[PDB]
């Protein structure tokens, strides 16, 4: 049934931007642990993540944490589209910036610690 | 005279050195020192008899307020309260500089006539925080 879409669900890892697939799916998606993959999401947004391999998760369930879900707007039980991107290209100093009106105890050089 | 006597107390113009006797505590402020800024007191200094009530300045907080010296016999609980409420009262910005939950409610249980409101007022005066009574 057009096996491009896939459901999202919880992840065990503490790190960000890591999707754990169900092992029986290696060569159908054709991407190994060294390939980053693009995942679609509502209001026309996307993300890209490296992938891990595990046994316990179900076939139809990606595992991914809150930070990588919110920007996709994907809420658990919702379905997103997964497509390999071996065409990855490095960047040169992506511009990164704090969010919100203010940060508690924030001053000085926060980049050598938080980045 | 008895207090300056056998003392040679160091003294600078403006200090509030307190004297105690006749079952009352009075403090005399030195307003003028012939040499400056400070001096020792000597038995050979003639003495001046004025005794006039100049009213105290508004900004200074009187010595009437209670301090830790007025409370004895509850050292452990007083130390606990001090270590518990020193940071929030005197270092408010820090608690905004870190994510932690300070206490905002304390109960004191004991028989009447033990100095609970006395302890509260002493802490309030010793940390300079505003005090409200209900
Ligand atoms: N270290 C002390 N411990 C207990 N009581 C004291 C101490 N020093 C003075 N007092 C006495 O405590 C009385 C005031 O206590 P009070 O405020 O009525 O306590 P409570 O509010 O618990 O009844 C004063 O009359 C004072 O003489």
UniProtKB/Swiss-Prot annotation, chain A:
Disulphide bonds in the chain = none
Q: Indicate the impact reported for residue 106 to F.
A: In IBMPFD1; uncertain significance
Can you say where in the cell this protein is located?
Cytoplasm, Cytosol; Endoplasmic reticulum; Nucleus; Cytoplasm, Stress granule
Q: Which residues carry this modification: Phosphoserine?
A: 17
Q: What is the effect of changing residue 111 to R?
A: Severely reduced binding to DERL1
What result is annotated for mutating residue 66 to A? Answer: Strongly increased affinity for ATP. Strongly reduced affinity for ADP
Q: Transmembrane ranges?
A: none
User: What's the PTM story here?
Assistant: Phosphorylated by tyrosine kinases in response to T-cell antigen receptor activation. Phosphorylated in mitotic cells. ISGylated.
Top-rank lineage group of the source organism: Eukaryota
Comment block on domains = The PIM (PUB-interaction motif) motif mediates interaction with the PUB domain of RNF31.
Instruction: Write out the similarity annotation.
Output: Belongs to the AAA ATPase family.
Q: What does this protein do?
A: Necessary for the fragmentation of Golgi stacks during mitosis and for their reassembly after mitosis. Involved in the formation of the transitional endoplasmic reticulum (tER). The transfer of membranes from the endoplasmic reticulum to the Golgi apparatus occurs via 50-70 nm transition vesicles which derive from part-rough, part-smooth transitional elements of the endoplasmic reticulum (tER). Vesicle budding from the tER is an ATP-dependent process.
Q: How does it assemble?
A: Homohexamer. Forms a ring-shaped particle of 12.5 nm diameter, that displays 6-fold radial symmetry. Part of a ternary complex containing STX5A, NSFL1C and VCP. NSFL1C forms a homotrimer that binds to one end of a VCP homohexamer. The complex binds to membranes enriched in phosphatidylethanolamine-containing lipids and promotes Golgi membrane fusion. Binds to a heterodimer of NPLOC4 and UFD1, binding to this heterodimer inhibits Golgi-membrane fusion. Interaction with VCIP135 leads to dissociation of the complex via ATP hydrolysis by VCP.
Tied to what disorder? Inclusion body myopathy with early-onset Paget disease with or without frontotemporal dementia 1: An autosomal dominant disease characterized by disabling muscle weakness clinically resembling to limb girdle muscular dystrophy, osteolytic bone lesions consistent with Paget disease, and premature frontotemporal dementia. Clinical features show incomplete penetrance. Frontotemporal dementia and/or amyotrophic lateral sclerosis 6: A neurodegenerative disorder characterized by frontotemporal dementia and/or amyotrophic lateral sclerosis in affected individuals. There is high intrafamilial variation. Frontotemporal dementia (FTD) is characterized by frontal and temporal lobe atrophy associated with neuronal loss, gliosis, and dementia. Patients exhibit progressive changes in social, behavioral, and/or language function.
Put simply, this protein is called Transitional endoplasmic reticulum ATPase
UniProt organism field:
Homo sapiens (Human)
Lineage summary:
Eukaryota, Metazoa, Chordata, Craniata, Vertebrata
